[PDB]
Amino acid sequence: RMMRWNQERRRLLIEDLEARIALMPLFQAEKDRRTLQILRENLEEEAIIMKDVPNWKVGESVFHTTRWVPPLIGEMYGLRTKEEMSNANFGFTWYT
Amino acid sequence: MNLYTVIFINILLSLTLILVAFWLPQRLPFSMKFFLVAITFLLFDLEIALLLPLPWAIQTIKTSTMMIMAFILVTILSLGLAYEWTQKGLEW
Amino acid sequence: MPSTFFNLTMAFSLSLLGTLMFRSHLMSTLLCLEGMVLSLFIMTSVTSLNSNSMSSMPIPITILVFAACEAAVGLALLVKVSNTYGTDYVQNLNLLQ
Amino acid sequence: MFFINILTLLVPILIAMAFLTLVERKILGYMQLRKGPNIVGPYGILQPFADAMKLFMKEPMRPLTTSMSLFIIAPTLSLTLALSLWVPLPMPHPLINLNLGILFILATSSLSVYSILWSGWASNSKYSLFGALRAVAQTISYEVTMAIILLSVLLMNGSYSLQTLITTQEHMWLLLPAWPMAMMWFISTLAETNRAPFDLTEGESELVGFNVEYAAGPFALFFMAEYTNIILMNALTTIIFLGPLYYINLPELYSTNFMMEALLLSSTFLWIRASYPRFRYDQLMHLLWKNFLPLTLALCMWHISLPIFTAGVPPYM
Amino acid sequence: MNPITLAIIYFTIFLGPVITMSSTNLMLMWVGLEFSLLAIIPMLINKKNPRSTEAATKYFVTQATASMIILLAIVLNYKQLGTWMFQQQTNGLILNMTLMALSMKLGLAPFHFWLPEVTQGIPLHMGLILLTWQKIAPLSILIQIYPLLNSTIILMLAITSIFMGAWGGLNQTQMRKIMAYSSIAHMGWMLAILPYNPSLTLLNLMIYIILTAPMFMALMLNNSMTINSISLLWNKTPAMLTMISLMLLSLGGLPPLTGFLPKWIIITELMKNNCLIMATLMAMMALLNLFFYTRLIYSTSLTMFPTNNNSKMMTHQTKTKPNLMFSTLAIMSTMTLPLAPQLI
Amino acid sequence: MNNYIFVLSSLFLVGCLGLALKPSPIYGGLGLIVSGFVGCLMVLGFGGSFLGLMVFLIYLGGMLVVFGYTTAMATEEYPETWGSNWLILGFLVLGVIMEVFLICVLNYYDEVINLDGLGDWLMYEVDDVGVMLEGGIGVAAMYSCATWMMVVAGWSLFAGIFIIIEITR
Amino acid sequence: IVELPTLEELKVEEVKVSSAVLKAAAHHYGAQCDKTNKEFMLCRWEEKDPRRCLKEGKLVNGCALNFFRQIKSHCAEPFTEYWTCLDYSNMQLFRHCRQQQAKFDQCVLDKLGWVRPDLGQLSKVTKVKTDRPLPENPYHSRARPEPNPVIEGDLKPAKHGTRFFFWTV
Amino acid sequence: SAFLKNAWAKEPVLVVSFSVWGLAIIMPMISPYTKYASMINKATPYNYPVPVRDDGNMPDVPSHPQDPLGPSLDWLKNL
Amino acid sequence: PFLDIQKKLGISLDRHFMFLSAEQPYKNAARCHAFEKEWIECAHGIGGTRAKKECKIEFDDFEECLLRYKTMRRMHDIKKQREKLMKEGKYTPPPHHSGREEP
């Protein structure tokens, strides 16, 4: 019975992993879209505060490579809502 | 946090009891056997560790290597036990 | 980790200062010795976890498995000493002068 | 609301703790041809509350030679860990569901061995130290097979989360399969709660060790702890091996049957106590290291093999 | 020892250095060091005499803390470079830790206090292993990382060791400790050339092994831990008096014998690299080492110390022979000098 | 909350300070247990459950129970020396406070502490939409991908028994 | 600078429906809309820079949106019943709801003709051809330094022999 | 054999203990399903399956998930 | 290493997992995998002495993906000004900090 039950369960495990497999492309488009927005939004504020800064371009990759680089969760929310930051850092661990 | 909330209530409940409990009212015992057990215990406790990831490792694509590895670990420790029995160890 | 890896590192140095300056009981060293292994285990696990380097998680544990036996040997020497001298006190260990 | 839930889990459990004591003093009684406590209150229902009040009022005694912390930390730790381990239990829904739930229960249990070690050192009298050393050994030994028995289970459950077993046991109890370990989980649950067949931790005829120097409030807290554990471990048997029927539409028939199976297996260790003489200290370890550990380690391998060649590797998650 | 245990231990004492040498993942190099620590401790207390427990408890604490420091270096590197292994970029302090730590396990210089004492309380046999098959492991780790270590520290530990070893040896009369002190000294030369030409470290080691292994099997043939004890060698077994003489002068740098080559080429390599300050001072106190070597020569060979009547009894009985290794390692050591070019 | 990890890390350091001041062996053990829990929570804070909980199982109740055990039969009673346990307590408290100001001083040197950047770095990157990225999946490479890591450890334990019995004998 | 795209550039319509709703229809979305999905994904993987594949992404949301509009047109009630039951479950498990699933799946095989993809047949890798040039130099790799030159020839007995101190050799 | 017998009746745990040790060391070797474990677990799709460009030179790869080409788990079905 | 019994025997028990870009389980790519590759395919065939000067662009970058300190700095710097500016009443977090929420 255990052999048959887990085989049934494994098939189910396959049926829902593929369900996200299908849903992922949408999430990828969404995540990126939103991610960039956070970076850019931070750019606006960045310029607003870095303009007065003496000879300090608003933003520059600490890394000279021009490859696209994912931002650290810290970069995305560090200057955003602290609560937002916290949620990203320890939100899942505390779950819900 | 949810866990933190529960746990501090847990300590609070116990500290409350002891406090009320104290407030409402108003040299050479040694046997290698014992030390030996403690040791064996960790040798086994460590092994428990090397055996704990087995639930995640079951799903490993290899499978053959998984079991080949796990069976070797269990067998070599058990032989350790075997020699513990054979020797005066485990005979208190 | 930038300053959370400095606390752990100084913990290891505070544990370092401990194992190196003995005082009476030998157990306190061994015990201290273990304080380092915990600090190393915590630091190894921490960086592996924030580097998402899962290929290396084996190490955090190999460190503990070897450290446990290491300590097993250490305690058997300790038991051997308070069987020959009735105490773990280090001063007793001065015959090889 | 979360607190409400915190209260709903702890308060009821604690009350259940109390009445277990009463139930232990009546089921042991009728088995021994005696009514048991019925004169205080109606049918002895007020009996558990009565000695609780007597225990807290009597003067807590701090022996001339006693640490004052390793003495007060020990009962606090014992009650704290036992009541804490009820936090992550599927009934069917857990208060704080943890992905690595069974490792939490195994780790929290392991910590209680200290309380025994700390109390024994704190008392500073010979009976206490001798009792603690043997006790820690019993508890620790019965941890090594206790852990391996769970690892066999998990590998057939797929995860460490206690919540998964409600989905694993939707067609059959894990007793049918794995009964050989249930027995070995039950006997180990009897050792880890220092109940009778294995009550050498604190033998009475032998060393009248754990609470020798503990009276009044400290006595009570461990005391409470032991009995809550008595339930918790029985409850873990009633989730891991005897899987109560789960219907997603009505969650309480899960808890209703969890109630029934837990009470019966809790009744069983009460029944075991009256029925058996206590084992010898070495006879106890002879069982675990000689009789059970080879059985458990081998059946552990059978549970890494049963999945693979029966193409039944359990679904993670 | 239940022969099974003997096998497990000996395998570990031998798997210990071998894993270190073979692996590149430093971690695996650390556990190789860890296994050597665990395997050696049982053998050290075989007599289980009160002196022995002291020996092991010191060896273990010294070895354990150093092992932990080596691990910390690997753990730190892991965060300064994701790699589990030292690289050009490695922070200098990261490498220096590894030098100090590894110089403690090998027992060089200001950490030279444990070795003389553990060499004094362990049997002559386990003395050899503790001196020569336990130096291979740490040295391997250093030789691998040579390009990166500091030339200054090594030199200081090198010079210090030479001095401490020499000075310590002059006073000692217990043989086990005279050898412990010599090993500290030779170990010093070895670590002096590591930054410049590792390949010579591996020569100054082999020659030390091919010199010390015969020397100790000589000390134990008559199991003499005293010079007075080795001095009556002339009565107990006269033939070994000739080679014991040359091997000890070979251990020091005197020119006709094989022992000169390690010092000569190390000096040639250091002068090639311009350390004519350092090399000179080392060679000079190296001469102090020969003084205590020759003082022993005097007692054992050039002068015949008085013996005991009960010795005539030990002569009568057939003397259990010295293994063949003694010869093959005595000659290859006392006189290979004519074949130096191919050795280097 | 954003300091949740700094604090835990801070307490760990203190815990280790205790062990260092070498209080009575068994109290020192209590210290290693306190640091142990704090540490476990640290690893359990950066996202690693298995690694952390294992710390508990193998090291909090598993290993030090032994330490306390042996510190029960062989380390005597720390007798006639208990008084220092109070002095040590003090230096510990004093040292803790010292460090308190100490790090404030280091914080001053902006040239790490990221006083403002606290809670912005406990985690750095995550596979937001990922599934099998849980600490442990890695710990299992020990059975398959990396087995060397197991064959070496396994030998240790096996040899360990033979070694300990031989030393103890 | 960083050349982060502007908001107006990244302001496109999205499904914005409860996870459950997507999940309930996921199996059919993986079916009716992978042609474009894949493309966006293939763009995403080979050109690591999302910014480069943003357009494909706007197409993604769009294709799905109508996917939903068509569902809205037909068999909508079924779908509504299926998602509501699916949402109640905590892990939104598919097997608790099979009777509701059969209706909607059956209906979409009467009204929309779309088909629920059999166990599998979504996990299998797909081939989608895209005009976007296989990004060359993804990772924007710089030039690899030149390999040290190679000593060439054949060995000849060493010159004058080991040239060690006075060894005619 | 005779001891075996008494062993079955005296110290009858080890006997059972070893027996299991072996039976677990054999069944895997000989079984009609052992192979499935490495497949059933291999198949379970956890990480997104990234699609390859269509050079048009590949007749093996299915251009669409529901196509008659590619891998199948009908072995998993009706297992 | 000192004795390469591994290359000789062809076995690879210790090399498969030495860097962050090695095969990670379930192909869950590590972080800084975009760089370590670029910093070790560069230093391949070029010895260290010359993997330390000319292949410094890729390490200076990989020293920043991982440590990610320049970012920390820039960010920390940004905050400071924001603090001072916020003192003068100059900077007022936009409601964008609390705007709609993109799916």
Range of the domain at B68: 2-92
Cβ-Cβ contacts under 8 Å for G28 (sequence gap 6 or more) = G67, G108, G114, G115, G116, G117
Residue F161 and residue B43 in contact, taking contact as beta carbons nearer than 8 Å = yes
How many beta-carbon pairs under 8 angstroms link A with G? 114
Residue G12 and residue G61 in contact, taking contact as beta carbons nearer than 8 Å = yes
What are the two backbone dihedrals, phi and then psi, of residue H52, each rounded to the nearest 5 degrees?
-90, 150
- The residue behind tokens 């590149």 is E24
| CA closest to C73 among chain F residues | F164
Chain-centroid distance of CA D127 in Å reads 25
Cβ-Cβ contacts under 8 Å for E220 (sequence gap 6 or more) = E124, E125
Give the mutation candidate from B1, B4, B58, B63 for the A interface (greatest A CB count, under 10 A).
B1
Judge: A50–I82 Cβ closer than 8 Å, yes or no.
Answer: no
Mark whether G and H touch (3+ CB pairs within 8 Å). yes
**Token pair listed for H76:** 């998993």
What are the two backbone dihedrals, phi and then psi, of residue I13, each rounded to the nearest 5 degrees?
-80, -20
- The residue behind tokens 């269509």 is H54
Cβ-Cβ contacts under 8 Å for E225 (sequence gap 6 or more) = E124, E174, E175, E176, E219
Residue D194 and residue D135 in contact, taking contact as beta carbons nearer than 8 Å = yes
- From chain E, the residues in CB contact with I3 under 8 A are 18, 21-22, 140
Bridge partners of E174, per DSSP, are E226
Q: Chains with ≥3 Cβ pairs under 8 A against H?
A: A, B, D, F, G, I
Q: What CA–CA distance (Å, rounded) separates I17 from I12?
A: 10
Q: What CA–CA distance (Å, rounded) separates E134 from E116?
A: 15
Q: What CA–CA distance (Å, rounded) separates C26 from C91?
A: 10
Judge: F161–B36 Cβ closer than 8 Å, yes or no.
Answer: no
Exposed, middle or buried by CB within 10 Å (0-12, 13-18, 19+), for C97? exposed
| CA closest to A18 among chain H residues | H45
Chain-centroid distance of CA E42 in Å reads 20
Give the mutation candidate from F128, F131, F137, F144 for the H interface (greatest H CB count, under 10 A).
F131
Cβ-Cβ contacts under 8 Å for E296 (sequence gap 6 or more) = E178, E227, E230, E248
Gap between the terminal Cα atoms of chain E = 41
Q: How far is D176 from chain F (nearest CA, A)?
A: 29
Q: How far is F66 from chain D (nearest CA, A)?
A: 9
Q: Least CB-CB distance to H28: which of B58, B59, B67?
A: B67
Judge: H34–D299 Cβ closer than 8 Å, yes or no.
Answer: no
Q: Chains with ≥3 Cβ pairs under 8 A against C?
A: B, E, F, I
Judge: I15–E22 Cβ closer than 8 Å, yes or no.
Answer: no
Resolution (A): 4.2
What are the two backbone dihedrals, phi and then psi, of residue E226, each rounded to the nearest 5 degrees?
-125, 155
| CA closest to I18 among chain C residues | C56
Other C-beta atoms closer than 10 Å to the C-beta of E206 total 15
Q: Which DSSP category does G135 fall into?
A: -
Range of the domain at D114: 2-317
Residue B18 and residue D217 in contact, taking contact as beta carbons nearer than 8 Å = yes
Give the mutation candidate from E21, E81, E139, E199 for the I interface (greatest I CB count, under 10 A).
E81
Q: What CA–CA distance (Å, rounded) separates F54 from B48?
A: 10
A18 close contact with D: CB closer than 8 A: no
| CA closest to I52 among chain E residues | E88
**Token pair listed for C69:** 């036996």
Exposed, middle or buried by CB within 10 Å (0-12, 13-18, 19+), for D96? buried
Where are the alpha helices (H) located in D58-192, listed in sequence order?
Answer: 73-84, 101-123, 126-155, 165-168, 179-192
Name the nearest CA neighbour of D157 among B59, G94, C57.
Answer: B59
D307 close contact with A: CB closer than 8 A: yes
- The residue behind tokens 């508890």 is D139
CA distances from D289 to F68, F78, H4 (A): 22, 34, 22
Judge: B14–D221 Cβ closer than 8 Å, yes or no.
Answer: yes
Mark whether G and A touch (3+ CB pairs within 8 Å). yes
Bridge partners of G102, per DSSP, are none
Q: Would you put residue E68 in left (φ > 0), alpha (ψ -120 to 50) or beta?
A: alpha
Residue E173 and residue E226 in contact, taking contact as beta carbons nearer than 8 Å = yes
What are the two backbone dihedrals, phi and then psi, of residue D82, each rounded to the nearest 5 degrees?
-65, -45
| CA closest to A3 among chain D residues | D312
Long-range contacts of I2-9, Cβ-Cβ distance < 8 Å, separation of 24 or more:
I2/E20, I2/E21, I2/E22, I2/E140, I2/E143, I2/E144, I3/E18, I3/E21, I3/E22, I3/E140, I4/E22, I5/E18, I5/E22, I6/E22, I6/E23, I6/E24
Q: What CA–CA distance (Å, rounded) separates D184 from D145?
A: 8
Judge: A14–H49 Cβ closer than 8 Å, yes or no.
Answer: no
Bridge partners of E226, per DSSP, are E174
The helix, strand and coil proportions of chain C, stated in percent and rounded to the nearest 5, come to 75, 0, 25
Q: What angle do CA H29, H33, H35 make, to 5 degrees?
A: 70
What are the two backbone dihedrals, phi and then psi, of residue E174, each rounded to the nearest 5 degrees?
-80, 135
Q: What CA–CA distance (Å, rounded) separates D1 from D12?
A: 16
B62 close contact with F: CB closer than 8 A: yes
Residue E325 and residue E217 in contact, taking contact as beta carbons nearer than 8 Å = yes
Bridge partners of G127, per DSSP, are H52
Scored b (16 or more CB within 10 A) or e, E314-339 reads eeeeeeeebeeebeebbbebbebbee
- The residue behind tokens 């972080």 is I31
**Token pair listed for G39:** 């493309």
Q: Would you put residue E274 in left (φ > 0), alpha (ψ -120 to 50) or beta?
A: left
Residue H65 and residue G28 in contact, taking contact as beta carbons nearer than 8 Å = no
Scored b (16 or more CB within 10 A) or e, G16-33 reads eeeebbbbbbbbbbbbbb
Name the nearest CA neighbour of E79 among F11, F113, C6, F135.
Answer: C6
Name the nearest CA neighbour of E204 among E270, E293, E115, E266.
Answer: E266
E31 close contact with F: CB closer than 8 A: yes
Other C-beta atoms closer than 10 Å to the C-beta of G119 total 18
D283 close contact with F: CB closer than 8 A: no
Q: How far is B18 from chain D (nearest CA, A)?
A: 6
Q: Would you put residue G16 in left (φ > 0), alpha (ψ -120 to 50) or beta?
A: left
- From chain B, the residues in CB contact with F147 under 8 A are 65, 69
C69 close contact with E: CB closer than 8 A: yes
Residues 222-281 of D with CB under 8 A from B: none
**Token pair listed for F155:** 């030998």
Name the nearest CA neighbour of E141 among E33, E69, E37.
Answer: E33
Q: What CA–CA distance (Å, rounded) separates F33 from F38?
A: 9
Q: What CA–CA distance (Å, rounded) separates H24 from H28?
A: 7
Residue E274 has, within 13 A of its CA and on its CB side, a CA count of 1
Name the nearest CA neighbour of I82 among I97, I65, I67, I70.
Answer: I97
Name the nearest CA neighbour of A69 among C14, F125, E138, E223.
Answer: F125
Q: What is the 3-state secondary structure (H, E, C) of chain E?
A: CCHHHHHHHHHHHHHHHHHHHHCCCHHHHHHHHHHHHHHHHHHHCCCCCHHHHHHHHHHHHHHHHHHHHHHHHHHHHHHHCCCCCCCCCCCHHHHHHHHHHHHHHCCCHHHCCHHHHHHHHCCHHHHHHHHHCCCHHHHHHHHHHHHHCCHHHHHHHHHHHHHHHHHHHHHCCEHHHHHHHHHHHHHHHHHHCCCCCHHHHHHHHHHHHHHHHHHHHHHHHCCCCEHHHHHCHHHHCCHHHHHHHHHHHHHCCCCCCCCHHHHHHHHHHHHHCCCCCHHHHHHHHHHHHHHHHHHHHHHHHHCCCCCCHHHHHHHHCCCCCCCHHHHHHHHHHHCCHHHHHHHC
F55 close contact with B: CB closer than 8 A: no
Domains identified in chain D, total number: 1
| H52 three-state secondary structure | strand
Residue E137 and residue E17 in contact, taking contact as beta carbons nearer than 8 Å = yes
**Token pair listed for D24:** 């232990």
Question: What technique determined this structure?
Answer: cryo-EM
Scored b (16 or more CB within 10 A) or e, D70-80 reads bbbbbbbbbbb
Q: What CA–CA distance (Å, rounded) separates H53 from G41?
A: 11
- Give residue F109's identity as a one-letter amino acid code: Y
Calculated CA dihedral for residues A96, B3, B9, B11, nearest 10 degrees: 180
Other C-beta atoms closer than 10 Å to the C-beta of H10 total 9
Residue E269 and residue E197 in contact, taking contact as beta carbons nearer than 8 Å = yes
Q: What CA–CA distance (Å, rounded) separates D150 from E180?
A: 52
Residue A15 and residue G120 in contact, taking contact as beta carbons nearer than 8 Å = no
| D243 three-state secondary structure | coil
Exposed, middle or buried by CB within 10 Å (0-12, 13-18, 19+), for B28? exposed
**Token pair listed for F127:** 């596979």
Residue A91 and residue B1 in contact, taking contact as beta carbons nearer than 8 Å = no
Residue G114 and residue G31 in contact, taking contact as beta carbons nearer than 8 Å = yes
Exposed, middle or buried by CB within 10 Å (0-12, 13-18, 19+), for A43? middle
Q: Would you put residue D62 in left (φ > 0), alpha (ψ -120 to 50) or beta?
A: beta
What does D143-163 look like in DSSP terms, one character per residue? Answer: HHHHHHHHHHHHHTTSSS-GG
Bridge partners of B27, per DSSP, are none
Exposed, middle or buried by CB within 10 Å (0-12, 13-18, 19+), for E294? middle
Counted residue by residue, chain E has a size of 344
Name the nearest CA neighbour of A5 among D175, A13, G118, G100.
Answer: A13
Q: Which DSSP category does F134 fall into?
A: -
Q: Least CB-CB distance to A9: which of D176, D311, D314?
A: D314
Q: How far is C83 from chain E (nearest CA, A)?
A: 10
Residue F46 and residue B28 in contact, taking contact as beta carbons nearer than 8 Å = no
Cβ-Cβ contacts under 8 Å for G91 (sequence gap 6 or more) = none
Q: What CA–CA distance (Å, rounded) separates A18 from H76?
A: 15
Mark whether I and G touch (3+ CB pairs within 8 Å). yes
Q: Least CB-CB distance to F70: which of B38, B50, B65?
A: B38
Bridge partners of H52, per DSSP, are G127
| CA closest to B4 among chain A residues | A94
What does G23-47 look like in DSSP terms, one character per residue? Answer: HHHHHHHHHHT-HHHHHHHHHHHHS
Domains of chain C (ranges; CATH) run 2-97 (1.10.287.3510)
| CA closest to H43 among chain A residues | A14
Helices E3-22 and E26-44 sit at what angle, rounded to 10 degrees? 150
Q: How far is G169 from chain E (nearest CA, A)?
A: 8
Residue I57 has, within 13 A of its CA and on its CB side, a CA count of 12
Residue E277 and residue E293 in contact, taking contact as beta carbons nearer than 8 Å = no
**Token pair listed for E106:** 């090998």
Q: What CA–CA distance (Å, rounded) separates D262 from D231?
A: 7
Mark whether F and H touch (3+ CB pairs within 8 Å). yes
Q: What CA–CA distance (Å, rounded) separates E161 from E148?
A: 21
Which sequence spans correspond to the domains of chain E? 2-344
Residue E23 and residue I14 in contact, taking contact as beta carbons nearer than 8 Å = yes
- Domain with residue B41: its CATH number is 1.20.58.1610
Residue B3 and residue D87 in contact, taking contact as beta carbons nearer than 8 Å = yes
- The residue behind tokens 């390949």 is E199
| G150 three-state secondary structure | coil
Q: What CA–CA distance (Å, rounded) separates G25 from G23?
A: 5
Domains identified in chain B, total number: 1
**Token pair listed for A14:** 């396959």
